[PDB]
Design a protein around this ligand. Structure first.
Ligand code: SAM
Ligand code: 25W
Ligand code: SF4
Ligand code: SF4
Length: 246
């Protein structure tokens, strides 16, 4: 029986305020849009609770989590249902004030992965520079120039263990409508594994499609998948839970 995912990334809202040249938002729109139905997030929390999920949970796919109107609710529910899990927010930081950071931290966020992206310098620069140490220690502050740019499953043409990949052995994405993907690169949802409104995520994780896919990619057979065949992402090649990889 395959190990449960150690990481789950939830699309609590589909939209972003930016259109980075190295992001599919610059060239396509998400095929699902909106904010996650609170009842669906509750269903996800019930399922993760039933598994004693204690890995990383994050709140983005290709949108900006601080735009989620129910972010406070969802972070609070995370702490209530899966107190052993590690909530980590990746954010462009454009909306991240000190007050916002502190509210989120109090509700359960353990780390913020904040990236200053191409274009306008955000106000978080000055906020970060003024943060007390205890808050500052909770932030990994990246520039987009620090990222190891992936072509996002071959969507981006302007972007140039070997080929092994462990993402689908370690991680699941839940889209805003509850569809489960095996990788965060699957912007176009080429590999929907199931929907958590119809099946328990554990059963989806362990189904033949998902089990076969993760074995295939562990062996480095990217060529056998429309999702992976042109993918240049080699950042996740071990079995370990991570907070972030560049
Ligand atoms: C798709 S972004 C989504 C969350 C939020 N919108 C943000 O930018 O932080 C998830 C993470 O991937 C990083 N990222 C964006 N484009 C990337 C790319 N082409 N290759 C690798 N990482 C990328 C972002 O900086 C962010 O840390
Ligand atoms: N390098 C980043 C890329 C991001 O899209 C994934 O969601 C995150 O898990 C990774 O750590
Ligand atoms: S801020 Fe994040 S989601 Fe938005 S366009 Fe840039 S990389 Fe994509
Ligand atoms: S090869 Fe690329 S698209 Fe396929 S699972 Fe790995 S990171 Fe995702």
């Amino acid at each position: 029986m395959d190990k449960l995912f150690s990481m789950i990334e939830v699309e609590v809202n589909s939209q972003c305020n930016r259109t980075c040249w190295y992001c599919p938002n610059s060239v396509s729109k998400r095929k699902e849009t909106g904010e996650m139905d609170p009842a669906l997030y509750k269903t996800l929390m019930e399922q993760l609770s039933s598994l004693d999920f204690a890995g990383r949970i994050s709140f983005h796919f290709y949108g900006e989590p601080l735009l989620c109107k129910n972010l406070d609710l969802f972070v609070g529910m995370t702490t209530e249902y899966i107190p052993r899990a590690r909530p980590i927010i990746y954010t462009n930081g454009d909306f991240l004030t000190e007050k916002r950071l502190q509210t989120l931290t109090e509700l359960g966020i353990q780390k913020f992965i904040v990236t200053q992206h191409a274009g306008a310098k955000h106000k978080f620069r000055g906020v970060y520079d003024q943060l007390a140490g205890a808050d500052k220690e909770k932030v990994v502050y990246l520039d987009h120039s620090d990222l190891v740019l992936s072509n996002r499953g071959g969507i981006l043409d302007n972007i140039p263990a070997n080929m092994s990949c462990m993402v689908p052995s370690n991680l699941a994405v839940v889209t805003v409508l509850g569809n489960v993907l095996p990788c965060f690169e699957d912007f176009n949802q080429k590999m929907v594994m199931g929907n958590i409104g119809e099946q328990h995520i554990s059963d989806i994780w362990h189904n033949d499609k998902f089990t076969s896919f993760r074995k295939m990619l562990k062996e480095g057979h990217r060529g056998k998948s429309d999702l992976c065949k042109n993918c240049n992402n080699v950042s996740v090649q071990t079995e370990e839970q991570y907070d972030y990889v560049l």
